[PDB]
Amino acid sequence: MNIMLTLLTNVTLASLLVLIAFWLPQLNAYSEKTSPYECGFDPMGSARLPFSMKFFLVAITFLLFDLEIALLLPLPWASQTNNLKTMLTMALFLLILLAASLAYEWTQKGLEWAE
Amino acid sequence: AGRIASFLKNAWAKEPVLVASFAIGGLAIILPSLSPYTNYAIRINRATPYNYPVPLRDDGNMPDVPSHPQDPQGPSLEWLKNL
Amino acid sequence: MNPIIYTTLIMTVMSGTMLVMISSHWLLIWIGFEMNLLAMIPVLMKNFNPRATEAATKYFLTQATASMMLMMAIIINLLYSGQWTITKMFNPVAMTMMTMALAMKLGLSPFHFWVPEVTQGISLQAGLLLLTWQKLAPLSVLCQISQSINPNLMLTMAMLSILIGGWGGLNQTQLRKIMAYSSIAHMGWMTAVLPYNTTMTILNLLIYITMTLAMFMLLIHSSATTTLSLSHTWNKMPVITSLMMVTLLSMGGLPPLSGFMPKWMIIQEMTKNESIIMPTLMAMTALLNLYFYMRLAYSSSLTMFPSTNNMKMKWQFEHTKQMKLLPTMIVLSTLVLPMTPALSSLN
Amino acid sequence: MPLVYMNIIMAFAIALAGLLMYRSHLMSSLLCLEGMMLSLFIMSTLIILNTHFTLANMMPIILLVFAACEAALGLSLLVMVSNTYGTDYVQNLNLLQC
Amino acid sequence: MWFEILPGIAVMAACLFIPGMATAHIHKFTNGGKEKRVAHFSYQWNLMERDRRISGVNRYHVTKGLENID
Amino acid sequence: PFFDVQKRLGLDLDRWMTIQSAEQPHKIPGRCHAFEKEWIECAHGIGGIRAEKECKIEFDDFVECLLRQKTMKRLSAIKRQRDKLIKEGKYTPPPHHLGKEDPRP
Amino acid sequence: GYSMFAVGIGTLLFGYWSMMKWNRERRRLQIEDFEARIALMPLFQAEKDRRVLQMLRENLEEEAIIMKDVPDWKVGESVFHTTRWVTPMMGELYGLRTNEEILSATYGFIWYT
Amino acid sequence: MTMYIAFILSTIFVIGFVGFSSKPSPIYGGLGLIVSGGVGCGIVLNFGGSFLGLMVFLIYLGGMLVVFGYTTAMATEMYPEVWVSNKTVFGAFVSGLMMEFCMVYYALKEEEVEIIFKFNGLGDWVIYDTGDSGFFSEEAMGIAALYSYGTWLVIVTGWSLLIGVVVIMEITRGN
Amino acid sequence: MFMINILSLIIPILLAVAFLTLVERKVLGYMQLRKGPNVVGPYGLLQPIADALKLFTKEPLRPATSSISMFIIAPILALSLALTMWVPLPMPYPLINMNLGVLFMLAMSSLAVYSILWSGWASNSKYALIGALRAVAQTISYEVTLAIILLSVLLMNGSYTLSTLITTQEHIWMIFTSWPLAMMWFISTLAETNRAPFDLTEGESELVSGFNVEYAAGPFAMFFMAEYANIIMMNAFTAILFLGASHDPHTPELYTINFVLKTLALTITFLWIRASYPRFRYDQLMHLLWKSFLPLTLALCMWHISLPIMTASIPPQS
Ligand SMILES: CCCCCCCCCCCCCCCCC[C@@H](O)O[C@H](CO[C@H](O)CCCCCCCCCCCCCCC)COP(=O)(O)OCC[N+](C)(C)C
Ligand SMILES: CCCCCCCCCCCCCCCCC[C@@H](O)O[C@H](CO[C@H](O)CCCCCCCCCCCCCCC)COP(=O)(O)OCC[N+](C)(C)C
Ligand SMILES: CCCCCCCC/C=C\CCCCCCCC(=O)O[C@H](COC(=O)CCCCCCC/C=C/CCCCCCCC)COP(=O)(O)OCCN
Ligand SMILES: CCCCCCCC/C=C\CCCCCCCC(=O)O[C@H](COC(=O)CCCCCCC/C=C/CCCCCCCC)COP(=O)(O)OCCN
């Protein structure tokens, strides 16, 4: 209930700053002024055209390595168990396969960006 | 013996980060099985009383169960204070 | 694809299926399906081309939808009973959702649309895998929860599968789509007897897998995927076309061939449960499968189609690779009817 | 049942419907698949917390793991489709018929 | 200077002193002067709820000693 | 279909997680531990067909603990009758139900 | 390079030793306060029992008054076939009370920050 | 009854689902799914699931960032669609909104079996348990049990993650 | 009285950001043999006020090709999250006491990136899009390593509660047990706050103004405020995590002073670093995080899991 009040206060302050920024100063908007910036000149194509991603394979791999973090975050609590040999074996096993998947993609040129 | 020597030489010269990483990983894997304190950690975890110790109904045939906490029977944590 | 990677992926497909088959927990069964699909997508695209990409994409979409539905059914079942064990579903709505999810995984009508397209889009080896090994897991799950399932929905989907397999197979000249529609009809037969006797389901599945393995291996040996390309095999390998002719008649279900045993066993079991009408429809409809098998046998073995001049060069070369189990598969596909009482060992 | 449970099941039904009815982009369907997983995670978590099944607190994490694998799988296929056609449209993949 | 950088650093340090000191003083002011109670687990929350009930003024911070057991 | 490798080898690959009454960490119990214990012990070894008829009482109690459908119905009935009798002024709620109780430890 | 690496490893070993001692002491302290909680638990259990039973009795009397006109209503009738004690649902205990107590009872601990 | 916070949160959850299921531009679909993930975090937090809520929020933030990159890379069109730039998207959005409205009305003013079963409402607080014990979080204990009880689960999930890396490398190879 | 505390936390933080702008200008000035602002107010004290007033009385412009709704939402999200990230910090007491404070910090930080992505996309300008895609790449580069480093360091603490970090370090700073993780963590916080040499998203030399080039006046000032607030917040977190200050329950002002001095030192170190180095190419940053930091981080996670068990040094509060 305190965190909800905090979030509400912060969003309200930011929104009021935007409101002031838009309603206090004088506004003189014309087409030349509101046009897209490309350093002196008119853009050739649209900025909504497909923009190639050369690290597309590291982006997919990030999705799988980010879930390794969800499996490793309970580790401070897992350390409190009685069968520490099973916990340590399992935790070590998990990080070893994470290192092996990194070694696989590295040696197969999966970390190099497309050319 | 001399193949791996020059191999680790070239690795330390070209990829010291990977050398240190494999050293630290291998140590983390093998050292816990040679330690006399891993059992101490298991025992420390077992000595932590998270829930209530439910008493047993005395039937006159329990020579090794205390009838009051300060009685001498039962487990002792003396080893822990001196640790 | 590196051979070691291909072996690892085939082993992951098989281990996902075995996880589905050995598990007692619904979550582990779901994990088995997930692992199977994950390893199976690359096997479809092993020979890269736009058609293989499209087939793998349609396959992934269908199977992932089925997976979400399956998980939702598990969660509703847990909500109405704090149970994770796969026995008999507690909630009727969860059972409907589960049945439809497994029917989508199997490709039963009306969820049959994906099977012909994906089968046509991939190679003959991947088609062999897709039409034999990919059936074990959902069928085993269905066998476990058989008492719980509603007969009306299951039998509706089974009769639809038989009808649609026959009708769709009538129109094909590509051999992979013929095999796919054949598979759809066979699945209909397997699921029609499921609420009565799971041993008959297992027997039907074993005989179908034997005949399908034999057919796919014969199609690989004579590297043909169309009807007209298979019309040449007589002028290079006549024994292959004769064996294919007999295997085709066994698929048709004609006696004294093995293919007739599953149909015969299923009809008999159904009559015991006072169900004369469903079986009469099923057999009269399997007549369509027999028709297009007979058409393929006409074009391939019983008559001789014209050939080409370059076949003379092929006359001089033996096959580089030989299939070890092809001979055994043909014999088990044709000559096993006298051993029918051995089905008791399946229960 | 509780109002909250009804809302989560409705979310699953809506995402399932979204997946079923395709438009032009494949990425939108992939998003619908993710949405279904999100609703399954929430529903299972609510049921598990409510009944105090302690050991079942780990299954939503497994659910997320597999969901990530499925998401990764979906994006790979989209990369290959887009490389073939220069577009991720569903209509392009009509080469194979029934 | 270089020591002319120090006035801005001092203003920034004075601005950063405020949140922690204000939180400490507000905690002490609204918790009977004794360091707002921490309830990370439900046992501590149960202790706080029992304290609120026995105070008689519906405040957890008010503490009843041995003068309350006749 | 179901090859029981666990039972043949005595492994416990996933049976530790199938039910709510089975060995939780720190002995934390399930909310419906006793009802489930009772339904499991009532139906054990008699098979699925007999268990659904002969253990329906235990299972109905278990489901009531799980979802609490009858309890919410009874509470709704009581509160509707309270609302109705209060609107007409026939019934006056006690002080200990309006916020003026003498709280006890 | 040797000197830098040696200073680093020595720093780490000193830190490890210090943290080992400090965390052992912390674990002893945690055991001690857990045992205080254990010594206190019976009194809390006794008064929790009395509090729950008193709330149930008050609800029962108010329900005997409220549900007298409805024709076929057994006051205090259980919804279970079993006759053993069932832990009361939160709604049953606070069903006939003010929204502030219901809020404090359901979300009081979760929201306390 | 009390503040019906979780009801508002679950309604916003459904609204975000309608937002991204209407199948508009992916930039707005991912926005809708982020909103849904955040309010689902809140829903789970209100029941005692702090770790699970925060975890699903974190995971979906990472996933939607990858999806934003892929949308600019392969999902772009000269005029990306919003919920009001298309009759088809707007119609799906409105139909989902008032379908949720009809479900919620029919459920809270009388007691109907929609598809599975029925419900009267009362707010979520009624089904709680009033349990009083512990120096720990039971959620944290059950999740930590993955390393002592759930050895088999750890094995199968680790294998699937390694295989997933290998699989994406195989799929995106080309040739 | 709780709103008094919220305002007490927020008003000061914005003032500290305002004067961090001046301190950075003067520190970079003196490292460059010049002075920086010394005219507007004694020693440039009034320069931040003039800058703020100049920005909020200038005309804000909405681009013709831009998506107006996301264009306006992005800076609101940025500033509101920058303010929110402060509430669980124990100084020595937190405004909000959380069980999982570290994990809340991670989630809010991970959500902060969307404002940069959305603002760049909403702008519908080429340079803004290039900046936004650089932000995608930057998150992919440092996100996995940053989380595993926190996990490894936190194992000694025993929980994810931020106030426990004070007790963990009653006798020694946690940097004497994990200085390698501390180094990698410092560089990851440089990358996570888009700061030189890791400030690829702004790309001032390369892309002129990156994601915020279109932005003018008040909306622009909001992005600036958010970034500098994040710079102070990260350093404060770094101070609490690796250089725990002794805390006296009966005199918390001493802890407050110690903590503020340490976070000021770390912020000035950021400014120094910016004055000293050349900018990393964006592909290179990914290589740096994935081929050097991630292997060492995996090995050190293994080591920090094994070490408390080997030595019977495991911490309390499961
Ligand atoms: C730190 C965050 C919080 C700060 C605390 C202060 C909160 C500030 C909130 C933000 C608003 C302040 C902006 C400052 C200028 C006012 C902008 C606007 O509200 O004024 C005019 C509003 O006027 C409207 O245009 C119409 C006037 C009357 C409208 C009728 C509304 C009903 C009132 C009935 C009249 C009877 C008396 C009412 C009082 C009881 C807009 O005119 P316009 O020229 O476009 O905009 C440019 C403004 N310029 C000229 C200063 C540059
Ligand atoms: C017959 C064929 C065998 C070889 C091929 C098998 C292929 C599958 C892979 C391995 C099979 C799984 C066997 C392990 C099952 C786990 C359960 C069992 O082992 O007990 C555990 C014993 O733990 C041991 O550490 C076993 C785990 C070691 C396995 C690590 C590597 C093995 C997998 C290798 C293949 C996996 C894929 C490839 C990756 C390299 C836990 O026992 P414990 O904790 O006392 O008591 C638990 C009860 N409590 C909680 C109440 C206290
Ligand atoms: C048993 C320990 C396991 C657990 C610890 C490890 C956990 C995490 C560490 C492993 C992460 C994955 C490592 C992936 C390896 C990639 C190899 C590679 O291909 O990179 C080489 C670089 O590395 C190599 O040279 C290949 C391997 C050479 C040996 C590397 C280390 C092997 C082990 C060395 C130490 C042995 C054990 C420690 C003993 C210490 C002495 C007492 C090429 O570099 P590029 O980036 O492509 O350059 C591009 C510009 N030209
Ligand atoms: C007894 C058991 C002990 C176990 C082992 C523990 C000891 C470990 C010993 C080694 C520790 C080394 C940790 C360092 C981690 C990264 C080191 C590294 O190699 O990174 C560099 C790159 O890292 C950098 O140089 C940083 C770039 C950005 C610099 C930013 C400013 C510089 C730093 C300022 C001071 C840092 C202060 C950090 C701590 C602050 C206090 C909290 C590698 O990149 P390249 O040289 O290009 O080679 C790659 C191809 N082979």
Give chain D's domains with CATH numbers.
Answer: 3-85 (1.10.287.3510)
By the 8 A CB rule, do H21 and D14 touch?
A: yes
Residue A78 belongs to some domain of the structure:
yes
By the 8 A CB rule, do I77 and I84 touch?
A: no
Calculate the CA I268 to chain-centre distance. Answer: 13
By the 8 A CB rule, do I230 and I14 touch?
A: no
Token digits of residue D7: 């809302």
Residue A67 belongs to some domain of the structure:
yes
By the 8 A CB rule, do I192 and I145 touch?
A: no
By the 8 A CB rule, do A58 and I286 touch?
A: yes
Token digits of residue C345: 């060992």
B27 sits in the region (left: phi over 0; alpha: psi -120 to 50; else beta) called: alpha
Give the residue carrying structure tokens 């001032």. I204
Which chain H residues touch A8 with a CB distance below 8 Å? none
By the 8 A CB rule, do H146 and A78 touch?
A: yes
Residue A93 belongs to some domain of the structure:
yes
By the 8 A CB rule, do C10 and H161 touch?
A: no
Cα-atom radius of gyration of chain E, to the nearest Å? 20
Residue A113 belongs to some domain of the structure:
no
Closest CA to H66 of H41, H39, H34: H34
Nearest CA in chain B to A84: B42
Domain ranges of chain H: 5-172
For C322, the enclosing helix (H) or strand (E) is none
Nearest-by-Cβ selection for F30 from D1, D52, D59? D52
Report the distance separating Cα H111 and Cα C28, nearest Å.
37
By the 8 A CB rule, do C19 and C35 touch?
A: yes
* Maximum pairwise Cα distance, chain F: 71
**Integer angstrom CA distances of residue B12 from A76, B6, B9:** 34, 10, 5
Q: Is A19 in the pocket of ligand 1 (CB under 6 A)?
A: yes
Q: What DSSP string describes I211-243? A: GGSS--HHHHHHHHHHHHHHHHHHHHHHHHHHS
How many C-beta atoms lie closer than 10 Å to residue F8's C-beta? 8
Q: What DSSP string describes C80-120? A: HSS--B-SS-S-HHHHHHHHHHHHHHHT-TTSTTHHHHHHH
List phi, psi (to 5°) of A82.
-85, -40
Q: Is there a contact between G107 and A3 if contact means CB atoms under 8 Å apart?
A: no
How many C-beta atoms lie closer than 10 Å to residue G112's C-beta? 17
Residues for chain F: how many in total? 105
Q: Is there a contact between F30 and D56 if contact means CB atoms under 8 Å apart?
A: no
Q: Is A93 in the pocket of ligand 2 (CB under 6 A)?
A: yes
With a CB cutoff of 8 Å and minimum separation 6, the contacts of C122 are C44, C52, C55, C56, C130, C176
Q: Is there a contact between A63 and D61 if contact means CB atoms under 8 Å apart?
A: no
By the 8 A CB rule, do I244 and I165 touch?
A: yes
A2 sits in the region (left: phi over 0; alpha: psi -120 to 50; else beta) called: alpha
Q: Which of residues 21-80 of A touch I (CB under 8 A)?
A: 21-22, 24-29, 31, 33-39, 43, 47-48, 51, 53-55, 58-59, 62, 65-66, 68-69, 72-73, 75-77, 79-80
Q: How many CB pairs under 8 A join A and G?
A: 5
Assign 3-class secondary structure to H20-52.
HHCCCCHHHHHHHHHHHHHHHHHHHHCCCCHHH
Which amino acid, I271? Answer: L
With a CB cutoff of 8 Å and minimum separation 6, the contacts of I301 are A72, A95, I148, I151, I152
Q: Which chains touch B (3 or more CB pairs under 8 A)?
A: A, F, G, H, I
**Integer angstrom CA distances of residue H38 from C46, H43, I111:** 40, 9, 10
By the 8 A CB rule, do F66 and F19 touch?
A: no
User: Can you tell me whether residue G93 is helix, strand or coil?
Assistant: helix
Report the distance separating Cα I130 and Cα A38, nearest Å.
12
By the 8 A CB rule, do F30 and D48 touch?
A: no
Closest CA to D71 of C9, H62, H33, A63: A63
How many C-beta atoms lie closer than 10 Å to residue E9's C-beta? 18
Which chain A residues touch H147 with a CB distance below 8 Å? 74-75, 78, 81, 86-87, 90-91
User: Percentage helix, strand, coil, to 5, in chain I?
Assistant: 70, 0, 30
Which residue range is the domain that position A70 belongs to? 1-108
- Residues with their C more than 2.5 Å from the N of the next written residue in chain I, i.e. before a break, are none
The residue of B27, B42, B46 whose CB has the most chain A CBs within 10 angstroms, and thus the best one to mutate to test that interface, is: B42
CA distance, residue G64 to nearest chain E CA (Å)? 28
Calculate the CA I92 to chain-centre distance. Answer: 19
CATH number (domain holding residue A57): 1.20.58.1610
How many C-beta atoms lie closer than 10 Å to residue A29's C-beta? 12
**Integer angstrom CA distances of residue H133 from D46, E47, I158:** 21, 11, 21
Which chain G residues touch H8 with a CB distance below 8 Å? none
Ligand 4, pocket residues at CB < 6 Å: B 15, 17, 20, 24; G 8-9, 12; I 180, 182-184, 186-187, 197, 238, 242, 273, 288, 292, 296, 303
Ligand 2: nearest atom to the Cα of H149: 50
By the 8 A CB rule, do D16 and H19 touch?
A: no
Count of structural domains within chain A? 1
Nearest-by-Cβ selection for I306 from B18, B23, B28? B28
**Gap from CA of I3 to ligand 1 centroid (Å):** 27
CA distance, residue E57 to nearest chain F CA (Å)? 11
By the 8 A CB rule, do F20 and F11 touch?
A: no
List phi, psi (to 5°) of D89.
-70, 140
Report the distance separating Cα I148 and Cα I144, nearest Å.
6
For I310, the enclosing helix (H) or strand (E) is helix I294-310
CA angle H148, H153, H158 (to 5 degrees): 110
